[PDB]
């Protein structure tokens, strides 16, 4: 079982790793676009692009499964130790606001890229069927090339040091002392 990723998304993931671990920069949840509308736009564009031979059913199945799957993996293999505090703040806020925080409402597509990158390890850790694996990897490739064709409007390199919106915000000293400290 092998999965390939286009080099642009690999460079984006490496930039994310540098931003978090080296540059100490967490992602901005109060952003314009989140994962739920990422998959909504993906489903809508693919459905309106091709014909209707019955692929829309498994398309919607894949989209809903990826949404719920993102909802579960947010605190399991995503979220670098720097970002655990930043999860804790908004989870406490949702506890105070008496509303439920599903990750698809604030989190951007970079964590989706992280989950796609770690997908082969989870696939190899299950006793799960071969043709299902092939169709899942094919849907993953289709989502990856769709993200390639919309890469400029989605992952634009911006520095938060001088811009309000840069899909990343700088970590404060107190935040660093709590997260990477004790």
């Amino acid at each position: 079982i092998s999965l390939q990723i286009p080099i642009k998304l690999k460079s984006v993931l490496v930039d994310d790793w540098e931003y978090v671990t080296k540059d100490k920069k967490i992602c901005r949840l109060p952003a314009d676009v989140t994962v739920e509308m990422v998959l909504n736009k993906y489903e809508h564009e693919v459905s309106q692009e091709l014909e209707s031979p019955g692929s829309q059913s498994q398309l919607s199945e894949y989209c809903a499964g990826l949404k719920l799957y993102f909802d579960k993996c947010l605190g399991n293999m995503l979220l670098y130790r720097l970002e655990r505090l930043q999860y804790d703040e908004l989870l406490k806020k949702s506890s105070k606001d008496q509303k439920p925080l599903v990750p698809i409402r604030i989190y951007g597509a970079i964590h989706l890229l992280r989950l796609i990158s770690v997908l082969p390890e989870l696939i190899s850790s299950t006793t799960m069927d071969l043709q299902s694996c092939q169709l899942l990897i094919k849907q993953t490739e289709d989502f990856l090339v769709w993200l390639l064709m919309h890469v400029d409007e989605y992952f634009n390199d911006k520095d938060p040091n001088r811009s309000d919106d840069a899909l990343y915000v700088n970590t404060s000293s107190q935040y660093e002392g709590v997260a990477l400290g004790m």
Binding site: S173, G177, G181, M182
Partner: peptide, 12 residues
């Protein structure tokens, strides 16, 4: 008293 200390970097 360990949360705040690291937040204000006191005691390290």
């Amino acid at each position: 008293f360990k949360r705040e200390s690291v937040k204000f970097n006191v005691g390290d």
